[PDB]
Amino acid sequence: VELTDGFHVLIDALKMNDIDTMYGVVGIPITNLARMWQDDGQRFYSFRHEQHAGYAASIAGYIEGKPGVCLTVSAPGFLNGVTSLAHATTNCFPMILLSGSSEREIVDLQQGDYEEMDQMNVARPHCKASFRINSIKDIPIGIARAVRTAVSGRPGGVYVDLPAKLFGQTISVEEANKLLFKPIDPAPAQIPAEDAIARAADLIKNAKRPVIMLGKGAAYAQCDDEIRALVEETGIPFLPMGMAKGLLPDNHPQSAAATRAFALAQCDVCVLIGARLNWLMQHGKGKTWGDELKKYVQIDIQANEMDSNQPIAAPVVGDIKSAVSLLRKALKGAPKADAEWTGALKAKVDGNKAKLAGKMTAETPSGMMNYSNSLGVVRDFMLANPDISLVNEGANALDNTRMIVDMLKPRKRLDSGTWGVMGIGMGYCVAAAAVTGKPVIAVEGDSAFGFSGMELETICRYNLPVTVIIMNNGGIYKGNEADPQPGVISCTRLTRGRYDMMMEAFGGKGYVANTPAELKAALEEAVASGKPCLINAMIDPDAGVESGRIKSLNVVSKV
Amino acid sequence: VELTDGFHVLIDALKMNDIDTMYGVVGIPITNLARMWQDDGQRFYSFRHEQHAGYAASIAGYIEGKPGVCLTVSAPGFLNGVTSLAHATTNCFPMILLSGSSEREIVDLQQGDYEEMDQMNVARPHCKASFRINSIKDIPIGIARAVRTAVSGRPGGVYVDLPAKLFGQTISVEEANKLLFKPIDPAPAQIPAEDAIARAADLIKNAKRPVIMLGKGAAYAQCDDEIRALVEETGIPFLPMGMAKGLLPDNHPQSAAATRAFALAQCDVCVLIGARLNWLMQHGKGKTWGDELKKYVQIDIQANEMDSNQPIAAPVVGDIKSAVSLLRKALKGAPKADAEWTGALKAKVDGNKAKLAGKMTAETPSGMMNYSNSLGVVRDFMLANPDISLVNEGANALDNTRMIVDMLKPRKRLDSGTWGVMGIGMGYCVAAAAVTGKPVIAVEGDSAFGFSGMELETICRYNLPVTVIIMNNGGIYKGNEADPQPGVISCTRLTRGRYDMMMEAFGGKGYVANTPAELKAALEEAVASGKPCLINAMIDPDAGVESGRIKSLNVVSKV
Amino acid sequence: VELTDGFHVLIDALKMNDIDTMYGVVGIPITNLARMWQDDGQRFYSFRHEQHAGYAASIAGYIEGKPGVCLTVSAPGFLNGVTSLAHATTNCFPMILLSGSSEREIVDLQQGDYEEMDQMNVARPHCKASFRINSIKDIPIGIARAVRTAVSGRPGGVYVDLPAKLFGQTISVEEANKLLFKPIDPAPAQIPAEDAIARAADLIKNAKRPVIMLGKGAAYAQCDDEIRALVEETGIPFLPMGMAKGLLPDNHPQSAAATRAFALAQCDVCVLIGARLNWLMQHGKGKTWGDELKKYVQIDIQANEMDSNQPIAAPVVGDIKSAVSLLRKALKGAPKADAEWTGALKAKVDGNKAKLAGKMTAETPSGMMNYSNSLGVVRDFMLANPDISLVNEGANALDNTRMIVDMLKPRKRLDSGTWGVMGIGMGYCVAAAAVTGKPVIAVEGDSAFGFSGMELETICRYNLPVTVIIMNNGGIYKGNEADPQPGVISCTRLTRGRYDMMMEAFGGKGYVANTPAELKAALEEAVASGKPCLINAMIDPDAGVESGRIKSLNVVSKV
Ligand SMILES: Nc1ncnc2c1ncn2[C@@H]1O[C@H](COP(=O)(O)OP(=O)(O)O)[C@@H](O)[C@H]1O
Ligand SMILES: Nc1ncnc2c1ncn2[C@@H]1O[C@H](COP(=O)(O)OP(=O)(O)O)[C@@H](O)[C@H]1O
Ligand SMILES: Nc1ncnc2c1ncn2[C@@H]1O[C@H](COP(=O)(O)OP(=O)(O)O)[C@@H](O)[C@H]1O
Ligand SMILES: [Mg+2]
Ligand SMILES: [Mg+2]
Ligand SMILES: [Mg+2]
């Protein structure tokens, strides 16, 4: 009777759930899992730190709608991975963290095992569910549980603990075949009732000044034409959140993105589609919303997200594709939004965009670009080459890129997200390249970059078509903060370094860009090369402001 | 400008969410909340221990489909309540535990505050969500969050922490009335996709030996007529779980309850409606399922419950009412289940019921009734008086009542549930009496009763129409286990006590029943009286078996 | 080769660590552990609820200085026990909760096992350490870890998870003998440095108005003569906390207990011996301490208890026996405290005691005793019969007993403790009787009693020499709060019940006491009988005040 083992049953179960890629870092007790995964013909991306393998997994989940899978070792490796899992869960990205763990007997008596930790218990605050697979016979069910939990309801992170003793267990191939199975419909549709839709429809029809807010939940849903149809049929102005950019093209005539403050302050009805009324929307409170309670329509798969911050006048619970489809039919043939309202917003958008144009054409000294004339080059490039992932993080580097760089296609913009995480950059690049097979451009604050910068080597090792643009202003927000004391560097300063040389250290191509012309030539060559590149963009140390757009959130001393 | 305070804003927010009843125990810092609730005209039931207030709240939730509300003090009182909250979440019963807590400054520095505990964080494993309301202005949103979390998705427990400093905060009546609101549609319908229903219809139409399993989730859904219609139109034999008894009348001709072992072992398609494939169903594994994987159809609102134990061939995710309605329509005109299958089960049920009838007719010596002839009296009574809640817990006292006492009406049988909790009895009695305004009968094992027995005084104090039957066999399972050493009583023995005298001690009516005839007269009189009664049923100490029906789950020494 | 099993190895390991008694409730999967424990000749006390078995265990730990052991079943049973474990840890009482748990495979995949819970993880906030013993071979080490953690450092609770699969494992007797071992010195002495003692000595010598505060840590230490020698040699006035009463006799001439407010407010140096500067001492802040920072000496085994609330001028870290012994030698021959100070306090003590005498002699109508003339009888009895445990809980019933009933012997008074827990009463009685072999008297508020009252049956079943005095005032604080609405009883009301009849229901002796004379005759007969008794003491419903001595801690509405 022929036998197989835990290693192979796990490999088979993952494949049966349509996993063909893992992101991780090897070591005891999972090195041979990664090896045999590769031997079987599957993809393993080895990173320089598990956190970045984890961030890769998180965004693979977002882009594909199936869980990104991260593989780590026990205690120290797991901890690094779980920080990323926490980020996945916060952002509603489907992800499975797989980690090796040590001996149950020793760990449970806290005796000081190799990399000792109750990883299953430690994971709980950071994921939807934390499981452990103890027996070879339970591998298929365990992986099914993990996948379903990751992709159903509000998508998010799942931890699966894999004790070292699992892998060496054996079972007959006959019995293994009998246990292996593919879950049916792991991310089911959830359809709202007619009266929930009708309530929303009535609110929208009676609105004088409606807006639609598209969140990354709407982008994640992959029902791009449904959402575009709703916007265009209703004639309602829309606003995208950071990663909802490109769901409809950012240059769509009904976009009110360039007059956000006025749009939100003056609207009466606001339709939230896969977007939380959280800190990014000032909790539906304060001067952002004209110091009044708006009439909110909200479409969300998570029932208890309703009334989290402000009373929701028309809650619609279900998956966005089902709900928007029904809402469209409910609104069939209804009058479009008032031309006075939409025309007023468009006039402001045109005016503000004209002002931005002026800023982007401004001339600066060599090696002293500002955020407008530098990012203006990236804007033009992305308008001409929209089928490219745009990774973005920083303060000024984040906010100005969100403003300036129009996305024409969905799920291309990948940024710091709900927790405003610095560190997602290089991991996001690896996963974006891996899952799309297309180029990636990253616009990185120089501080932001340092959180994941060593993964430049990972990007070179896999010869990925990634161009990293460092917005090198020489520090956090600014690069010119004075020494607080004699010979003492300010805490916000960074070396205005040759990141180009660091890229070249690992076989990539480096550029220095001192002017917009040089940045343009570098970017065009870099993307065309299809090879790993870094462009060191020399930004004026005085160009940025404190915390970018969220300056007012800082706590300052008054004594 | 007229002011109000946290006490009143909280009272009003609870009322806006249709809460008119709390179960609790008073003390610092919440006595005056309870007082003002009563002063306002709402109901407060004071118990002798918070655990029983908590169990009361949990079953109020099950019966009504709105969260039962428990009020406790800080640390020691909170802990008692949170054990019941854990039970509620485990059983999918909607419940809100409200507890006072101490000073944030002192507790957060672990300095030894009055009843010091981080109750919010301690609650987390035992509920769907644990919240704290710090500001008077957030009371309406906080309660909305709690109610929505309790009743939406899979219903369950929610903890709401109320720091002592909340209640004395003040606000204008004008501003408070602006903040107060009623959540729209807190427990929304969730409708499954057409293909999910079609997959279920296909399996049912091709089944040779189908069964339908009804769980307490089906009962909770309150679509009794729809479920009965599905059963009757398909002609499929059905089996109720413990608290699904009465969803369809237990004497319905399609019930296979009296031939459960054969039905489950021999079936091909099994339709799980609001019932988990957990320990109560032996995880869909082993001898009880003929050592094979059945074709499971499952209807559940919790997406990731699918494939928790065995592969589910037709997962139907959504609320049971919506799903059953669609499934019915998907099966319209299909032939009824095979007559040789349904005929075979009916013959077995008829034979088994005949054997049980023989047992219930058995004659026993005075003071030495067995479980059949004693519970046969309760059976006849409940058939003549079906509009009464039947509370039940114990081992033999539980299993034999579930078998013998037929329920004709839904949501009347209230038992130990998913964790097989001893302790639910008297709390369940108070809540059932309070929410139904009708009589309650409790069939209690004598050990079972001791977990909540002090609450007889609560039952007497509120003059509730509750008749408690103590199955007094003098111990756990049996009352005759030999002294393990000379002069040393066995750990399983209990005093064969005068529980009637204990009831009389608090103004209740006490009876001793030594024969079925005495039990019958006592029960009829007690229920008819409309007063709090206890019947001390004298059961043969040798009548029961080890752990009743779950004898085989015991761990025994073989050395 | 002869074999033994998990059951027997565990029994042997417990005995080797000097455990001969467990308190618990049986059921799957531990019934046969309890049975075989009894078969071996050890004591098992079966309760009616695990919480009270747990409270028993906690106080057995306090009285004996070795961990009280509580045994429960999985999930629901464990939860009940862990509430008591949390109380043990809060009070620094050594305790081990042993609980059965279910199948690792099933529980770890959250599949719905019998009584499913990660009990090990759930216990963590409530104990010093939470362990699980997976393998038969690790039982001796596991029990050693539990005992050491329970009794060393700051004593407290420990949870040991015992999966069902442990008990049936086998091992050769030869190998079992080799693994069994007794831990060496599980509660070691910890001796402070000379300079720590010298600092304290200097502070004490230079004090003008010193006081010594004795906490229950000092009582727990069992170095009664060391502490008495320190007090008498220094001539410093002392004050006992609630359970430190009797460490020195409460009628000792240097006791300042009867002038506490003045003593604490006017002292300059305060010596804390096994007593935390927590809420019981108003955190060393406010008018209790004359609104100033005192010069604190503190002796405690827990280093980081120092500076928890107020700066400690002379921290002495180590075990109380070692520290007090060294301090005595450091103070050898030093002048006694100023006679002006000690004489001033004694004059106030005599005056206040004379006033109390007047109250205790006061005459009241039959069935309307107050707290002074009723508890005056208990005072006289305990002065004449000091070798009796005095259990005490309630509000007015607690505070007035602490004031009125002088303890002459150490570790006899057992009360609500650090969390002011209602519920410790009947469990405390069982353990006190079990470990002392001497009588127990309980003074119980009627509300307090209801939290554990069913355990009267447990007290009768084991024929324990326990006399329960119910301070029956008919409610919480008072028994006469008006109906808030027509026909609606106030939340603070309780049935003024015949608790005497409840005692007699289970074979105990009941008394009703309407006057001090009747209370005295009843108490003398009850204690002399050596049998289980309850005295139902009829207290004036209007005698008590809101929350007793902590009235000012209540939160009251001002609108
Ligand atoms: N397929 C889906 N259908 C409906 N709602 C979804 C779906 N996927 C995610 N969501 C919801 O989308 C929301 C995402 O909000 P958020 O991350 O705050 O977006 P943003 O940051 O763009 O505003 C979450 O509330 C989540 O429950
Ligand atoms: N309204 C509802 N619609 C669909 N499923 C529900 C609803 N309410 C509860 N449920 C589900 O019902 C199930 C109850 O199962 P369980 O408590 O195991 O029942 P039983 O013990 O009777 O078999 C849970 O899985 C829960 O998610
Ligand atoms: N043997 C011992 N030696 C020194 N300190 C001890 C010993 N046993 C317990 N303690 C300490 O005694 C203190 C007990 O304080 P607490 O419970 O607040 O007493 P009280 O409530 O009587 O004031 C704890 O800080 C604990 O660390
Ligand atoms: Mg920078
Ligand atoms: Mg019994
Ligand atoms: Mg009282």
mmCIF file of N, CA and C in Angstrom, chain B residues 415-443:
data_model
loop_
_atom_site.group_PDB
_atom_site.id
_atom_site.type_symbol
_atom_site.label_atom_id
_atom_site.label_comp_id
_atom_site.label_asym_id
_atom_site.label_seq_id
_atom_site.Cartn_x
_atom_site.Cartn_y
_atom_site.Cartn_z
ATOM 1 N N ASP B 415 -33.491 23.973 26.259
ATOM 2 C CA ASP B 415 -32.630 22.990 26.925
ATOM 3 C C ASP B 415 -31.150 23.387 26.998
ATOM 4 N N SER B 416 -30.310 22.430 27.392
ATOM 5 C CA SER B 416 -28.900 22.678 27.699
ATOM 6 C C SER B 416 -28.076 23.169 26.507
ATOM 7 N N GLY B 417 -28.555 22.904 25.293
ATOM 8 C CA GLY B 417 -27.965 23.491 24.096
ATOM 9 C C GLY B 417 -26.589 22.971 23.717
ATOM 10 N N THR B 418 -25.851 23.801 22.988
ATOM 11 C CA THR B 418 -24.630 23.374 22.297
ATOM 12 C C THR B 418 -23.505 22.933 23.238
ATOM 13 N N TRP B 419 -23.355 23.614 24.369
ATOM 14 C CA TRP B 419 -22.356 23.246 25.369
ATOM 15 C C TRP B 419 -22.890 22.266 26.418
ATOM 16 N N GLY B 420 -24.128 21.796 26.256
ATOM 17 C CA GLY B 420 -24.764 20.948 27.265
ATOM 18 C C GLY B 420 -24.635 21.525 28.671
ATOM 19 N N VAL B 421 -24.955 22.805 28.814
ATOM 20 C CA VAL B 421 -24.787 23.523 30.081
ATOM 21 C C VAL B 421 -25.799 23.071 31.136
ATOM 22 N N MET B 422 -25.285 22.633 32.283
ATOM 23 C CA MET B 422 -26.080 22.548 33.509
ATOM 24 C C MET B 422 -26.028 23.933 34.154
ATOM 25 N N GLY B 423 -27.192 24.493 34.469
ATOM 26 C CA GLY B 423 -27.282 25.842 35.035
ATOM 27 C C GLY B 423 -28.278 26.755 34.351
ATOM 28 N N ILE B 424 -28.774 26.359 33.183
ATOM 29 C CA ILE B 424 -29.702 27.222 32.430
ATOM 30 C C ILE B 424 -31.134 27.263 32.979
ATOM 31 N N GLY B 425 -31.497 26.312 33.840
ATOM 32 C CA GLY B 425 -32.904 26.059 34.186
ATOM 33 C C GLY B 425 -33.731 27.223 34.707
ATOM 34 N N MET B 426 -33.376 27.712 35.888
ATOM 35 C CA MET B 426 -34.209 28.706 36.559
ATOM 36 C C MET B 426 -34.172 30.053 35.839
ATOM 37 N N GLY B 427 -33.012 30.435 35.307
ATOM 38 C CA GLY B 427 -32.922 31.622 34.458
ATOM 39 C C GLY B 427 -33.795 31.532 33.214
ATOM 40 N N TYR B 428 -33.752 30.385 32.544
ATOM 41 C CA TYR B 428 -34.634 30.133 31.396
ATOM 42 C C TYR B 428 -36.107 30.240 31.790
ATOM 43 N N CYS B 429 -36.452 29.732 32.972
ATOM 44 C CA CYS B 429 -37.832 29.810 33.462
ATOM 45 C C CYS B 429 -38.303 31.261 33.608
ATOM 46 N N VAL B 430 -37.463 32.112 34.198
ATOM 47 C CA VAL B 430 -37.838 33.506 34.433
ATOM 48 C C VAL B 430 -38.055 34.233 33.105
ATOM 49 N N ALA B 431 -37.099 34.090 32.185
ATOM 50 C CA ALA B 431 -37.191 34.730 30.873
ATOM 51 C C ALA B 431 -38.391 34.222 30.067
ATOM 52 N N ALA B 432 -38.579 32.906 30.033
ATOM 53 C CA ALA B 432 -39.716 32.325 29.307
ATOM 54 C C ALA B 432 -41.040 32.852 29.862
ATOM 55 N N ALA B 433 -41.169 32.863 31.187
ATOM 56 C CA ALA B 433 -42.356 33.435 31.820
ATOM 57 C C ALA B 433 -42.526 34.910 31.445
ATOM 58 N N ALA B 434 -41.438 35.680 31.515
ATOM 59 C CA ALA B 434 -41.489 37.131 31.267
ATOM 60 C C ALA B 434 -41.882 37.476 29.831
ATOM 61 N N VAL B 435 -41.276 36.793 28.864
ATOM 62 C CA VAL B 435 -41.460 37.159 27.460
ATOM 63 C C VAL B 435 -42.729 36.555 26.849
ATOM 64 N N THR B 436 -43.191 35.414 27.372
ATOM 65 C CA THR B 436 -44.383 34.742 26.829
ATOM 66 C C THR B 436 -45.691 35.136 27.524
ATOM 67 N N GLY B 437 -45.611 35.466 28.810
ATOM 68 C CA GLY B 437 -46.799 35.700 29.618
ATOM 69 C C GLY B 437 -47.651 34.451 29.775
ATOM 70 N N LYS B 438 -47.031 33.277 29.623
ATOM 71 C CA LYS B 438 -47.728 31.996 29.705
ATOM 72 C C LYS B 438 -46.978 31.070 30.673
ATOM 73 N N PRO B 439 -47.588 29.927 31.046
ATOM 74 C CA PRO B 439 -46.918 29.037 32.002
ATOM 75 C C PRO B 439 -45.618 28.407 31.491
ATOM 76 N N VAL B 440 -44.779 27.994 32.434
ATOM 77 C CA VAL B 440 -43.542 27.295 32.142
ATOM 78 C C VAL B 440 -43.499 26.033 32.997
ATOM 79 N N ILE B 441 -43.043 24.936 32.401
ATOM 80 C CA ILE B 441 -42.683 23.719 33.136
ATOM 81 C C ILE B 441 -41.191 23.450 32.925
ATOM 82 N N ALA B 442 -40.471 23.184 34.019
ATOM 83 C CA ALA B 442 -39.069 22.789 33.951
ATOM 84 C C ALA B 442 -38.930 21.331 34.387
ATOM 85 N N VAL B 443 -38.326 20.505 33.535
ATOM 86 C CA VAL B 443 -37.967 19.134 33.905
ATOM 87 C C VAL B 443 -36.469 19.126 34.181
#
